[PDB]
């Protein structure tokens, strides 16, 4: 009811202030080993993501049941764009934590994992080719939270999304981009979210085939987050 009040600059500051902390891995090396690290890291990040979601303007306005639906839909998407963002400075590597930088080949420690790594690495390359900005990152991530499950006067969430588009554009204008360049970059940015959705769907399947085979125990939170998609 008040996120529609924010200035572009205030939306950016809000989103930046809301950023979750960067966590370390328990890492001190098998298929079990590595899966435990990744999923254990994921469980801990998920808890911090909830605090973050709650600081996204417009989100706390929603019913509890709608917040649950949005996070259940978007969680792995949000986890992954975070990962990709972190790994942007490390070509060919994935920065899960500051003490867990994994090259492409280490993805083969776990079965089926390297195919997912490749997509994450290519998205990261794409962020780098675009010179993706932190201010742009946090808008993109907020957009995912509000958008991914939204299709399920019910027009408020769409107003918040518009405000975030306004913010992305503000950032670009500020950077000295022409009108035609703002528009093309805005499009470029958003088409990435289609690749991020794809990676999440693939990640979800793999995670779920890992639950069954049983290489490693998953947290209760993780299981419920997973089962919302099954």
């Amino acid at each position: 009811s008040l996120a529609l009040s924010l200035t572009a600059d205030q939306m950016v500051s809000a989103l930046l202030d809301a950023e979750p902390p960067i966590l370390y891995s328990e890492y001190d090396f098998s298929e079990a080993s590595m899966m435990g690290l990744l999923t254990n890291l994921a469980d801990r990040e998920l808890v911090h993501m909830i605090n973050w979601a709650k600081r996204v303007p417009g989100f706390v306005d929603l019913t509890l049941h709608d917040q649950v639906h949005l996070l259940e839909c978007a969680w792995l998407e949000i986890l992954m764009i975070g990962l990709v963002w972190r790994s942007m400075e490390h070509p060919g590597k994935l920065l899960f934590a500051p003490n867990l930088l994994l090259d492409r080949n280490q993805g083969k420690c776990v079965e089926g994992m390297v195919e997912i790594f490749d997509m994450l690495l290519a998205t990261s390359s794409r962020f780098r080719m675009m010179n993706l900005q932190g201010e742009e990152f946090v808008c993109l991530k907020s957009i995912i939270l509000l958008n991914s499950g939204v299709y399920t006067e019910k027009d408020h969430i769409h107003r918040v999304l518009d405000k975030i588009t306004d913010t992305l554009i503000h950032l670009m204008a500020k950077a000295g981009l022409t009108l035609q360049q703002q528009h093309q970059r805005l499009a470029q940015l958003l088409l990435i979210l289609s690749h991020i959705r794809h990676m999440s769907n693939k990640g979800m399947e793999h995670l779920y085939s890992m639950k069954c085979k049983n290489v490693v125990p998953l947290s209760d939170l993780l299981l419920e987050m997973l089962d919302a998609h099954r």
């Binding site: 808890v47 909830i50 709650k54 509890l64 917040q67 649950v68 996070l71 259940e72 209760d220 939170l221 419920e224 987050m225």
Partner: peptide, 9 residues
């Protein structure tokens, strides 16, 4: 759901 609880907490 745990998530319900996280959100409230």
């Amino acid at each position: 759901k745990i998530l319900h609880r996280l959100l409230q907490d």
